[PDB]
C-alpha cells in the first residue's frame, strides 16, 4: 500500500517536530528580552507620578478634566493585540472579555467607540462593526512612542470635546512565565494613584513654575497617559511571546503522538504486505 509514502510522511512530521522546538527556543529568549525591557520604563512613570501628585496636592485650587469623574454617556476602548497568530488563545480571550464588557455597557444605554492596535484587533472589530476612530498596524516588538501617539491622541481629542467620558485600556497581564490574564482598566479618569503619599511626609517647599501651573499640569498629564499606554503595550508583547512558547511546546507534543500512532499503522501494513506476498508466491508455486 505504498509504504514509502508513509515513511516519507513520518520523516516529514519528525522534521516539523524539530522545527517547532527551535521556535520555542527563540520564543523563550524574546520573552526574556521583553520582560527585562518592561523594567526600564518604570523610573520615568514613577518620577512623573511623584511630580504630578506633588503639584496637584500643593495647588488644590482647580481640578483638571482628567482627574474629575463626570457623568458617563460614551466610553472608549484602546485594544492592543498581536499582528500574527500562532500564539495560544490570547487574542480570542481578550476579545471575549471586551465583548462581554461592551455588552454589559449596552444595558446602561451608553454606546462605545474603539481605537485598535494590531492586525488581529483591526480585523475582528472591522467585522464586528462598532464605531472605530483609528487603526494602527505593524507595531513590532520594540515600538517607538511615536507609533502610539496616534491612537491615544485621537482618544484624548475625542475626550476633550465631551464625546467621551471614560477610556478603557484593554491588554494582557504578565502573571508568570507561563500564564497570562486579560485586563480591562480605565486610564483617562485617572484613579488617584497613591495620592496619600507626600501628605504626612510633605515638606514646606514648592517648585518655581516657569509657566503657569495649569499649563504645566496639562503637559504632565498628557505625557503620563502616553507612557502608561506604551508600558501597557510592552507587557502585551511579553505575554504574546510566552503564549507562543506554550503553543509551540503543545504542537511538539501533539506531533510526537502522531508519530507513535503512524508507526503502529505502518508496522501492521508491513506485516500484512509480507503475508500477502508469501501467500501469492506459495499459491503460484503449488499451481505449477
Partner 1 sequence: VQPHVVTVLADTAIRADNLDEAAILEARKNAEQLLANQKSDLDSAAALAALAETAAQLETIRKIKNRAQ
Catalog residues that contact partner 1 under the rule CB under 8 A.
1, 6, 9, 12-13, 15-16, 19-20, 22-23, 44, 47-48, 83-84, 86, 138, 140-142, 144-146, 223, 248, 251, 255, 258, 262, 265, 268-269, 272-273, 275-276
In the bound state with partner 1, the residue whose beta carbon lies nearer, of 65 and 84, is 84
Cα separation, 173 vs 240, in Å, equals: 10
Pairing of strands 111-117, 74-80: parallel
Please identify, using beta-carbon distances, which residue of 142 and 177 lies nearer to partner 1: 142
Residue 25's contacts (CB-CB under 8 Å, 6 or more residues apart) are none
User: Minimal distance in Å, beta carbon 171 to partner 1?
Assistant: 20
Give residue for cell 511546546: 249
Phi, psi of 186 (to 5 degrees): -80, 150
Q: Which three cell numbers stand for residue 150?
A: 496616534
Q: In whole angstroms, how close is the CB of 265 to partner 1 at the nearest point? A: 5
* SS3 per-residue string spanning 97-136: HHHHHHHHHHHCCCEEEEEEECHHHHHHHHHCCCCEEEEE
Q: Which residues pair with 171 in a beta bridge?
A: 183
| Minimum distance, C-beta of residue 142 to partner 1, in the bound complex (Å) | 6
Q: Toward partner 1, which CB reaches closer, 184 or 258?
A: 258
Closer residue to partner 1 in complex, CB, 69/146: 146
Closest CA to 96 of 66, 56, 50, 128: 128
Nearest-approach distance from CB 19 to partner 1, in angstroms: 5
Q: Which is nearer to partner 1, 273 or 281 (CB)?
A: 273
CA distance 135 to 196: 38
- As measured in angstroms, the least distance from the Cβ of 2 to partner 1 is 9
Distance of closest approach, residue 84 Cβ to partner 1, in angstroms: 5
- Nearer to partner 1 among residue 45 and residue 154 (C-beta): 45
Please tell me the distance from the alpha carbon of residue 142 to that of residue 30, in angstroms, as a whole number. Answer: 11
β-pair partners for 180: 174
Which cell goes with 132?
Answer: 472605530
Q: Minimum distance from CB of 144 to partner 1 (Å)?
A: 8
Q: Which is nearer to partner 1, 7 or 65 (CB)?
A: 7
Amino acid at each position: 500500500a505504498n509504504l514509502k509514502e508513509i515513511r516519507a510522511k513520518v520523516a516529514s512530521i519528525k522534521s516539523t517536530q524539530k522545527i517547532t522546538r527551535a521556535m520555542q527556543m527563540v520564543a523563550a529568549s524574546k520573552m526574556r528580552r521583553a520582560q527585562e525591557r518592561m523594567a526600564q520604563g518604570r523610573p520615568y512613570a514613577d518620577n512623573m507620578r511623584r511630580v504630578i501628585a506633588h503639584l496637584v496636592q500643593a495647588n488644590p485650587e482647580y481640578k483638571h478634566r482628567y482627574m474629575v469623574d463626570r457623568p458617563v454617556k460614551r466610553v472608549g476602548y484602546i485594544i492592543v493585540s498581536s499582528d500574527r497568530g500562532l500564539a495560544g488563545g490570547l487574542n480570542i480571550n481578550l476579545f471575549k472579555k471586551v465583548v462581554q464588557h461592551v455588552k454589559a455597557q449596552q444595558e446602561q444605554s451608553i454606546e462605545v467607540q474603539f481605537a485598535l492596535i494590531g492586525q488581529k484587533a483591526v480585523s475582528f472589530f472591522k467585522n464586528y462593526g462598532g464605531k472605530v476612530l483609528g487603526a494602527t498596524t505593524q507595531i513590532g516588538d520594540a515600538p517607538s512612542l511615536e507609533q502610539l501617539t496616534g491612537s491615544v491622541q485621537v482618544m484624548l481629542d475625542a475626550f476633550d470635546k465631551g464625546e467621551l467620558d471614560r477610556i478603557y485600556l484593554v491588554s494582557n497581564g504578565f502573571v508568570n512565565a507561563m500564564t497570562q490574564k486579560p485586563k480591562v482598566e480605565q486610564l483617562v479618569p485617572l484613579a488617584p494613584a497613591e495620592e496619600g503619599d507626600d501628605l504626612n511626609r510633605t515638606y514646606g517647599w514648592d517648585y518655581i513654575y516657569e509657566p503657569e501651573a495649569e499649563e504645566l499640569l496639562n503637559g504632565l498629564l498628557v505625557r503620563y497617559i502616553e507612557s502608561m499606554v506604551y508600558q501597557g503595550v510592552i507587557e502585551n508583547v511579553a505575554c504574546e511571546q510566552s503564549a507562543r512558547m506554550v503553543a509551540m511546546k503543545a504542537a511538539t507534543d501533539n506531533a510526537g503522538q502522531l508519530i507513535k500512532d503512524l508507526q503502529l499503522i505502518y508496522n501492521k501494513l508491513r506485516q500484512a504486505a509480507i503475508t500477502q506476498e508469501i501467500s501469492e508466491i506459495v499459491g503460484g508455486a503449488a499451481a505449477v
